[PDB]
Amino acid sequence: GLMQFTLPVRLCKEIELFHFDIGPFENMWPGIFVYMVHRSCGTSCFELEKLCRFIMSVKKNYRRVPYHNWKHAVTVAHCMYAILQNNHTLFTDLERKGLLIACLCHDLDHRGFSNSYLQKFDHPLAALYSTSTMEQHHFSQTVSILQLEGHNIFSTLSSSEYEQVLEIIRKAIIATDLALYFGNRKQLEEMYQTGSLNLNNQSHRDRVIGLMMTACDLCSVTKLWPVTKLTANDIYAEFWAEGDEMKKLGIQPIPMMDRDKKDEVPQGQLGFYNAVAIPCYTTLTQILPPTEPLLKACRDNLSQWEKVIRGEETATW
Numbered sequence: 682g683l684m685q686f687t688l689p690v691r692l693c694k695e696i697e698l699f700h701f702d703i704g705p706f707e708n709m710w711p712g713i714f715v716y717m718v719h720r721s722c723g724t725s726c727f728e729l730e731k732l733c734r735f736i737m738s739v740k741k742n743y744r745r746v747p748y749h750n751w752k753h754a755v756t757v758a759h760c761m762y763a764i765l766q767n768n769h770t771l772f773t774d775l776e777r778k779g780l781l782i783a784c785l786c787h788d789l790d791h792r793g794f795s796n797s798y799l800q801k802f803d804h805p806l807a808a809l810y811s812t813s814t815m816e817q818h819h820f821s822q823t824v825s826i827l828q829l830e831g832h833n834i835f836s837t838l839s840s841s842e843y844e845q846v847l848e849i850i851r852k853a854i855i856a857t858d859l860a861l862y863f864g865n866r867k868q869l870e871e872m873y874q875t876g877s878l879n880l881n882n883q884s885h886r887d888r889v890i891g892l893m894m895t896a897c898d899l900c901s902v903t904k905l906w907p908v909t910k911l912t913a914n915d916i917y918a919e920f921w922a923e924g925d926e927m928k929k930l931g932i933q934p935i936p937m938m939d940r941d942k943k944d945e946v947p948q949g950q951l952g953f954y955n956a957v958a959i960p961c962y963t964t965l966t967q968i969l970p971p972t973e974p975l976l977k978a979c980r981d982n983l984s985q986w987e988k989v990i991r992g993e994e995t996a997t998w
């Protein structure tokens with residue numbers, strides 16, 4: 682308690698906004714994450730020395746890829762922080778402890794390739810894990826790190842509590858497989874509209890937490906336009922590299938991964954907001970009304986992509 686984390690005045694205020702950007706200073710991101718853990722969980726949730734050792738080992742096992750990198754891990758974590766702070770009565774002690782950690786760890790050792798490419802490549806991980814291939818790898822990496830000497834950030838939990846929080850983290854990381862999101866949002870939509878959704882039902886909590894993980898994972902579409910536009914360059918750098926690797930295998934890539942189809946990006950973005958993003962934040966807002974600013978920011982960026990398609994805005998590449 683004696684030593685507390687503090688941010689400069691601008692960061693202290695703006696970190697509470699859903700659309701906060703964590704900035705270009707990598708050396709500040711560990712401090713920003715600890716600050717969020719102290720405020721959303723408590724200063725006693727973890728021993729600062731173990732948490733600090735854990736954070737630096739996680740950082741080291743993210744790779745130097747354009748998008749699925751250490752900055753994405755902390756960005757996804759910050760979106761979970763904003764959801765938890767604005768819904769603070771709804772989550773348990775273990776959920777607060779597990780969910781920021783799950784977000785930090787959710788893309789561990791990502792190489793910038795989709796499950797589909799690992800399948801077509803016949804990558805060994807595809808034989809180890811037939812479904813949610815990369816996500817089961819991310820979880821396995823989380824367990825490896827937690828089992829390093831001095832890295833057990835959950836050391837004060839009983840065996841049964843430790844087992845629950847690892848099960849929260851496992852389900853949360855697996856839910857970031859966007860293939861699973863379509864089914865989970867459909868279920869949640871029907872449960873909501875038929876008035877059957879029950880936050881005391883553990884299988885219902887799992888689905889709600891899954892949707893929160895999708896919303897956090899996609900949260901780059903919920904930033905102010907200048908941040909959303911520049912981040913779109915990072916995701917497409919990975920997609921186009923995968924598309925190149927698909928062509929090397931003699932397989933035609935899907936249009937969003939073909940770097941020859943760069944002029945069609947604004948229409949593909951429009952396609953993604955309508956089929957995925959807007960439905961995602963809409964269902965989240967129905968279940969957790971204080972998450973409204975995510976949906977509003979998503980609608981604003983959708984309107985910007987339409988302005989691009991009408992030639993009223995220009996996307997520099």
Ligand SMILES: O=C1NCc2ccc(NC(=O)c3nc(C4CC4)ccc3Nc3cncnc3)cc21
Pocket residue numbers: 859898899901902909910912913916937949950952953956
């Ligand atoms: O269905 C589609 N038809 C065409 C198309 C094109 C692209 C996409 N996907 C994305 O754009 C996207 N995907 C992810 C998840 C890894 C999957 C996360 C963020 C994303 N966008 C984004 C936007 N702005 C700033 N940062 C990131 C889907 C389609």
Ligand SMILES: [Mg+2]
Pocket residue numbers: 787788815857858
């Ligand atoms: Mg992922």
Ligand SMILES: [Zn+2]
Pocket residue numbers: 753757787788857898
């Ligand atoms: Zn991710």
